Amino acid sequence: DQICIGYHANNSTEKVDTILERNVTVTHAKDILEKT
Amino acid sequence: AVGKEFSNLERRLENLNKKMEDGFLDVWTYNAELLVLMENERTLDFHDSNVKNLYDKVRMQLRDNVKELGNGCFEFYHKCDDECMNSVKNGTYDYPKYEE
Amino acid sequence: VKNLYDKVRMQLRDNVKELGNGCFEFYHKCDDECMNSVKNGTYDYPKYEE
Amino acid sequence: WQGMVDGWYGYHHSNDQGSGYAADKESTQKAFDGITNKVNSVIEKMNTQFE
Amino acid sequence: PFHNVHPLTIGECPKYVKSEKLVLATGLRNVPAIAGFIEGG
Ligand SMILES: *[C@@H]1O[C@H](CO)[C@@H](O)[C@H](O)[C@H]1NC(C)=O
Numbered sequence: 001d002q003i004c005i006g007y008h009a010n011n012s013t014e015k016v017d018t019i020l021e022r023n024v025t026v027t028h029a030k031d032i033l034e035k036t
Numbered sequence: 037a038v039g040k041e042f043s044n045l046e047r048r049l050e051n052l053n054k055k056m057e058d059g060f061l062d063v064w065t066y067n068a069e070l071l072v073l074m075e076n077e078r079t080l081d082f083h084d085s086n087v088k089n090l091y092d093k094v095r096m097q098l099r100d101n102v103k104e105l106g107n108g109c110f111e112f113y114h115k116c117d118d119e120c121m122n123s124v125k126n127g128t129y130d131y132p133k134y135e136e
Numbered sequence: 137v138k139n140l141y142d143k144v145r146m147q148l149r150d151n152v153k154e155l156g157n158g159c160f161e162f163y164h165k166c167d168d169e170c171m172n173s174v175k176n177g178t179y180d181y182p183k184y185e186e
Numbered sequence: 187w188q189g190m191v192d193g194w195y196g197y198h199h200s201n202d203q204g205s206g207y208a209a210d211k212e213s214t215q216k217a218f219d220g221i222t223n224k225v226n227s228v229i230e231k232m233n234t235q236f237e
Numbered sequence: 238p239f240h241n242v243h244p245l246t247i248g249e250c251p252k253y254v255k256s257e258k259l260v261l262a263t264g265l266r267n268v269p270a271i272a273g274f275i276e277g278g
């Protein structure tokens with residue numbers, strides 16, 4: 001039988017922007033702007 | 037220490053201090069936002085190429101004793117048990133031992 | 137454009153041959169329904185054979 | 187290909203019934219939006235103020 | 238490296254930016270037995 005190759009997914013709704021895309025959901029992100 | 041004290045007859049100087057602050061602020065804001073956007077596109081492309089690279093690493097070792105399925109999976113033309121599956125993950129699949 | 141080529145290559149699988157110039161050729165007669173399915177991403181691979 | 191005019195990426199379709207150029211709507215549209223956003227990031231993120 | 242708290246600071250501070258959000262992806266695109274990387278995580 002088969003062996004599939006893939007990657008991690010989770011329940012994150014954290015979104016980031018890129019040059020080509022907007023509102024892209026990522027599994028993990030780091031905020032590098034200190035707001036508090 | 038940001039912020040300087042100027043008298044009311046120094047407005048033409050206070051304004052230069054303001055300009056450096058606004059000037060550097062636009063430089064850093066523009067660069068910070070493009071740095072983040074450029075890095076995020078590179079990051080996502082990196083991750084997508086890493087999983088494809090893994091697929092090819094596997095494809096290259098499995099060679100002709102498998103078929104690709106077209107959905108990012110492979111199927112063997114021979115019985116493949118835990119030792120076989122572990123070898124594929126390990127990069128030790130003994131291709132010459134198996135046949136269709 | 138390369139990604140498109142591979143999307144197509146992956147669905148056409150073994151019922152085609154690559155030509156080496158960025159084109160594919162079928163080993164079976166391929167009419168408008170067939171060609172449209174390849175463009176659509178619905179090529180019914182199991183229905184065709186060499 | 188000079189002939190395709192209905193998008194950036196597409197197909198030739200040379201079957202026995204005739205040859206025509208079709209844009210791969212999904213590929214063209216995604217690339218199109220990607221480029222548009224790129225141009226806008228360069229332009230829209232530039233800050234202006236009265237000076 | 239960056240902050241948006243206030244433009245006037247005293248001390249050894251991050252750079253001030255006119256931005257509400259600088260977020261780096263660190264993870265994978267969270268794309269939401271039958272498939273691999275082709276269809277999603
Ligand atoms: C997502 O949420 C469900 C509960 O609705 C939980 O059982 C599951 O483990 C969570 N999955 C991940 C990847 O966080």
Ligand SMILES: *[C@@H]1O[C@H](CO)[C@@H](O)[C@H](O)[C@H]1NC(C)=O
Pocket residue numbers: 022023
């Ligand atoms: C991005 O997300 C914001 C909410 O944080 C929303 O207002 C905006 O319309 C979204 N942009 C796009 C292109 O979806």
Ligand SMILES: *[C@@H]1O[C@H](CO)[C@@H](O)[C@H](O)[C@H]1NC(C)=O
Pocket residue numbers: 126128
């Ligand atoms: C690969 O196989 C060898 C031989 O059985 C074993 O010693 C080694 O630990 C395996 N490596 C991995 C990553 O499983």
Ligand SMILES: *[C@@H]1O[C@H](CO)[C@@H](O)[C@H](O)[C@H]1NC(C)=O
Pocket residue numbers: 176178
């Ligand atoms: C794909 O095929 C289906 C079934 O004939 C049709 O309804 C759909 O519109 C086609 N899509 C495209 C992009 O041609």
